[PDB]
Every structure is written in C-alpha cells, then in structure tokens.
Amino acid sequence: LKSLEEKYVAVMKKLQFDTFEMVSEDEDGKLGFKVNYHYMSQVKNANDANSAARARRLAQEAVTLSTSLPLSSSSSVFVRCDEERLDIMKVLITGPADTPYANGCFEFDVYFPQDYPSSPPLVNLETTGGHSVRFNPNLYNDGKVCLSILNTWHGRPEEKWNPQTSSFLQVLVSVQSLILVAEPYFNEPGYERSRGTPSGTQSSREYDGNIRQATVKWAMLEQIRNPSPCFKEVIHKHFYLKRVEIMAQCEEWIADIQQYGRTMSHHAAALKRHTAQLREELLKLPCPEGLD
C-alpha cells in the first residue's frame, strides 16, 4: 500500500542514471554523434590531451551521480553518460512544485572541457522552444545556464567553481535551488528591491504567467510529442504517472491567471490552448511497462 509519491519515486529511481551511445568512433578514430548535443564542436575539436588525472576525476564525477541524484515527486534529476567518453553527458531535471516550472521536464547538455577540473563543466539548457523562451533571468534564450558555481554569474569567491571541492552533483542541485524557483522574476539583479511592492507583485505575476504557459508547451507538450531518445522512457513514465496531477495543476494555473491586465489575458489564453493539447497527449499515452 504505497502512496502515489512513493510509487512515483520507486519507478523513477531506476531511470536516474545510465549510459547511452551518444557517439561512435571511426576507423580513423573520428567521433560521429548519434544524438543532438550542444558541444559537438568542442568534442570534435578537443585536440584531446588524454589526461589521466582528468579521467580519474571524471570517473569520480560519474560515481557520485550514479548514487546521489535528487529524487522526489516535486523535483528529480536524471543523467545519461556516453558509454565510452567520460566528458559527455545529458541531464533532465523536472520542475519543482510551487514554481512556474512544476512538473515540466527540462533538458540540459553537459561538456567537461579539456581543462576540467581547473575550469568548470559547460552546461546548456536545451529546452528553450528553439530559443523562443527566456525561462529565467539565469536561463538565456540561447540556453546559457548562469550560476556562480559555473562561473557564469557573479558571487563571492567561495561561491565560484572550486577545482578541489566543487562537483557536478553540486551544480545540478544549484539549478534546483537557485534557478528553478518560485517568483523567478526577482532573480534579475536589482529587481529584488521591488519585492513586496504592488508594482513588484504585478511584474512577478506577469513573469510567472509567461513561464507557466512556456512550461506546459515546451517542457510538457513538446517533450511528450518529441522526446530526446536519451529520456524517452523517463518522459513517458513521468507524464503518465503524474497525468491527473498535471491536469489539476494546469487548471489551477488557469484559474489563478484569470483573476487578473491585457497581458495576463494573453498568457491565460496561450495556457488554455496548450492545456487542451496536453490533455489529448496525456489520454493518448500508452501504459508504460515497467510499473510492476
């Protein structure tokens, strides 16, 4: 007699870490890619130094990720590693509850550069609606992930990439903690002054309304329609298990936005279209096999 959350956690736990054939080596040692990957050029032009210390460190990264990825009904992290290359990864983070990202699936590409761990990993958000969405002050239209731990955002020196003590697990957790938050509007530096003022509250709401509709469209509807081959199973099972919950959430979001304001009406209207298409995908979704 497990709850829905316990059942979800149990199912998703098995899908959190695995390898995938992302690249293949030629006769001429040349890499050919099997999936879409933001850093293909960096991989192809790496002029690989074949550093043993880097290799040992990357395998330490993988070990941590194989056992310690965050997992919960609210928000979970899923990782795929190439079968041979230690520096090529793909991740999926689901959006935390009580945020405009809730239950969306957000895909990132990861590259550990030739000068890792002296320099941080490169992370790019792939779920941008073809660069049409700015998902956060810290998530650019082009996919840039801005965190001080990645040296892509300001902060104190202890908050920067530290080659001795930093890790990729910490970067992943920093995305949940610092980017995929409630009231993302205020992540823009200086905007925090507005917090608690009617002007501030109003701007945050309009911001939330745009992020909500984009989550449903791109982080849900288009993830089901067109999943990454790396995460097809995760997506399928995630949306199937939570389908009732997501329909209630979409309705709640619609109810909430309509309390308000020409642009709120624009958001409410996009959300409604996206929700009705999503309902059709959710119903059409075949039952996944690995349930019990």
**CATH label of the domain that carries residue 132:** 3.10.110.10
Please report the resolution in angstroms: 2.0
Q: How far apart are CA 192 and CA 189, in angstroms?
A: 7
Instruction: Report helix, strand or coil for 142.
Output: coil
Structure tokens at 273: 């279209």
Which residue do the tokens 């979970």 mark? 76
Which residue do the tokens 């290799």 mark? 55
Classify 108 in phi/psi space as left (phi over 0), alpha (psi -120 to 50) or beta: beta
Q: What are phi and psi of 242, to 5 degrees?
A: -100, 10
State the angle between helix axes of 243-257 and 262-284 in degrees (0 to 180), rounded to the nearest 10: 170
146 is annotated as an active-site residue? yes
Pairing of strands 17-20, 77-82: parallel
Number of H helices and E strands in the chain, helices first, is 9, 7
Residue 6 burial class via C-beta count within 10 angstroms: exposed 0-12, middle 13-18, buried 19 and up: exposed
**Active site residue: 146, 230, 250, 287, which one?**
146
Instruction: Report helix, strand or coil for 126.
Output: coil
Reply yes or no: is the peptide bond before residue 117 cis, omega within 30 of 0.
Answer: yes
Q: How many domains does the chain have?
A: 1
| Host domain of residue 105 | 1-292
> Which residues face 105 on adjacent strands?
94
Looking at residue 263, its amino acid is T
Residue 250 burial class via C-beta count within 10 angstroms: exposed 0-12, middle 13-18, buried 19 and up: buried
Structure tokens at 205: 């709401």
